[PDB]
Every structure is written in structure tokens, then in C-alpha cells.
Design a protein around this ligand. Structure first.
Ligand SMILES: *[C@@H]1O[C@H](CO)[C@@H](O[C@@H]2O[C@H](CO)[C@@H](O)[C@H](O)[C@H]2NC(C)=O)[C@H](O)[C@H]1NC(C)=O
Lengths: 49, 17
């Protein structure tokens, strides 16, 4: 905004985004799906839910 | 149309000695 050899001035426009939490979860586990093997009319099959 | 197999993840049921 101003520039002299002994004096300056500046302006900055900052925008912020604040997330507001509804709930926070701390003690968490990932799932892993191993399923089961089945043998049927000669064919080996992997089964999963 | 015959009834097929049942699974239940129980290891103890499938033990072989
Ligand atoms: C898993 O398999 C075992 C073996 O079939 C089951 O354990 C038996 O349970 C009966 C009662 O239903 C008892 O009379 C036997 O003494 C048990 N035997 C053994 C080797 O544990 C067991 O009930 C099955 N189900 C679960 C969830 O474990």
C-alpha cells in the first residue's frame, strides 16, 4: 500500500475454512475379509461375505 | 435341488488327530 525508502505498508487477504465436528472417534480398527474355502463337485471355491 | 453345505468358521469342529 505504501513504499518509501524508510517506510512500507502491506495488506493481506486471508480466507479460512473451519470444519465443525459432529462426532469424533478415537479407538478404531480396519476390517480385513479372509472368507473361507469350499470344495464343490470337483471345483475349489473361495467364499466371502 | 439337493441341500448344499453349511459353514460356520469353527476350527475345533474340523480338528484331525
Ligand atoms: C465348535 O466346534 C466344537 C466341536 O464340535 C463344539 O464344541 C463342543 O460343544 C458341545 C456342546 O454343543 C460339547 O458337548 C463338547 O464337549 C464340545 N467339544 C469340543 C471339542 O469343544 C463347539 O460347541 C462349536 N461351536 C463353538 C462356537 O465353539
Amino acid at each position: 500500500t505504501h513504499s518509501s525508502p524508510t517506510a512500507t505498508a502491506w495488506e493481506i487477504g486471508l480466507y479460512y475454512e473451519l470444519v465443525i465436528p459432529k462426532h469424533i472417534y478415537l479407538n478404531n480398527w480396519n476390517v480385513v475379509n479372509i472368507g473361507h474355502l469350499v470344495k464343490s463337485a470337483g471345483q475349489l471355491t473361495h467364499v466371502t461375505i | 435341488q439337493v441341500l448344499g453345505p453349511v459353514i460356520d468358521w469353527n476350527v475345533t469342529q474340523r480338528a484331525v488327530y
